[PDB]
Amino acid sequence: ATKAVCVLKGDGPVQGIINFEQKESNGPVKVWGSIKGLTEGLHGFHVHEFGDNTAGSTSAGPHFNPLSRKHGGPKDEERHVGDLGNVTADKDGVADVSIEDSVISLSGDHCIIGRTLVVHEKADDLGKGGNEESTKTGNAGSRLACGVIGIAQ
Amino acid sequence: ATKAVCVLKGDGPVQGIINFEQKESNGPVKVWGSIKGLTEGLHGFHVHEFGDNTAGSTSAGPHFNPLSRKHGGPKDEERHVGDLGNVTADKDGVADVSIEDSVISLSGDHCIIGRTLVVHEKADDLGKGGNEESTKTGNAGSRLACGVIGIAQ
Numbered sequence: 001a002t003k004a005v006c007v008l009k010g011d012g013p014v015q016g017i018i019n020f021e022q023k024e025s026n027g028p029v030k031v032w033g034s035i036k037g038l039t040e041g042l043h044g045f046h047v048h049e050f051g052d053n054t055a056g057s058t059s060a061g062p063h064f065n066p067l068s069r070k071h072g073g074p075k076d077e078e079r080h081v082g083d084l085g086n087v088t089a090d091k092d093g094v095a096d097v098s099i100e101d102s103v104i105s106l107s108g109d110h111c112i113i114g115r116t117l118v119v120h121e122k123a124d125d126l127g128k129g130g131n132e133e134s135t136k137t138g139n140a141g142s143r144l145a146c147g148v149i150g151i152a153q
Numbered sequence: 154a155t156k157a158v159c160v161l162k163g164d165g166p167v168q169g170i171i172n173f174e175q176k177e178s179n180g181p182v183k184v185w186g187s188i189k190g191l192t193e194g195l196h197g198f199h200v201h202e203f204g205d206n207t208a209g210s211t212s213a214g215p216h217f218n219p220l221s222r223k224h225g226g227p228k229d230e231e232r233h234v235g236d237l238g239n240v241t242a243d244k245d246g247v248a249d250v251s252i253e254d255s256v257i258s259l260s261g262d263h264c265i266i267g268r269t270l271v272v273h274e275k276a277d278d279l280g281k282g283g284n285e286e287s288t289k290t291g292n293a294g295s296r297l298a299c300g301v302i303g304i305a306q
């Protein structure tokens with residue numbers, strides 16, 4: 001029953017705390033928390049490869065992708081491990097994240113501990129945009145906030 | 154070579170960047186970087202258990218101690234895995250860090266990825282202080298800056 005947690009911060013108003021819980025090593029990860037300061041609507045939500053914040057969110061590298069696959073949505077078989085899809089911010093700018101994913105893990109080679117959670121400026125097109133960028137980043141625009149995923153009590 | 158990085162930050166002027174490198178999974182970890190904004194002299198320098206920054210530095214928990222030992226300095230046989238002793242700040246308040254350690258690791262059971270690196274108000278007394286707290290924290294006083302230890306490129 002490992003746990004992890006991530007504090008999201010950036011240059012702008014997006015601030016949040018995201019929790020991870022995985023009761024069994026072979027099991028689904030529950031991802032939940034509140035993010036505020038977001039524009040209303042959809043925002044791309046990814047684990048990027050490096051837990052490196054030295055040059056801000058830009059040093060976090062690309063989507064966490066140990067199987068060298070193409071970018072998709074969390075329901076797709078063809079996706080990056082870090083592809084968690086979108087979160088939705090309400091009219092007050094609050095996204096109450098609630099996600100369950102079976103591809104990220106808190107252990108083994110899909111481990112995301114020590115990597116960077118990023119919430120994005122726009123919607124992830126889940127790889128359905130018809131351009132090369134769609135199958136790379138999902139066209140979710142800029143990295144509005146980020147933080148390193150840490151082991152939690 | 155496994156690599157890791159930590160960006161140390163806090164409420165005041167103390168901030169810095171610490172890098173970690175471990176060429177061999179069963180070899181020592183080299184630790185180097187720079188911290189500025191410090192009072193001249195000795196400052197405790199610890200890996201704390203949790204990569205949890207939700208309540209600032211205080212949620213980081215106690216020193217990382219997977220073998221349940223007593224607190225000491227890094228050369229001691231009786232030490233926490235997280236006990237990296239002290240860094241030294243010059244008259245300009247810059248601590249140039251350059252350490253090698255064989256107890257911390259970037260993989261496996263002693264793995265510090267996803268935990269919290271902390272730099273402290275005062276000297277770590279290396280467990281030679283003579284009170285209870287010496288055997289736990291080293292009496293290094295406040296947590297001035299911290300960061301989660303992240304996987305680096």
Ligand SMILES: [Zn+2]
Pocket residue numbers: 044046048063118120140
């Ligand atoms: Zn992204």
Ligand SMILES: [Zn+2]
Pocket residue numbers: 046063070071072079080082083136137138
């Ligand atoms: Zn992706």
Ligand SMILES: [Zn+2]
Pocket residue numbers: 197198199201216271273293
């Ligand atoms: Zn400490």
Ligand SMILES: [Zn+2]
Pocket residue numbers: 216223224225232233235236289290291
């Ligand atoms: Zn200790």
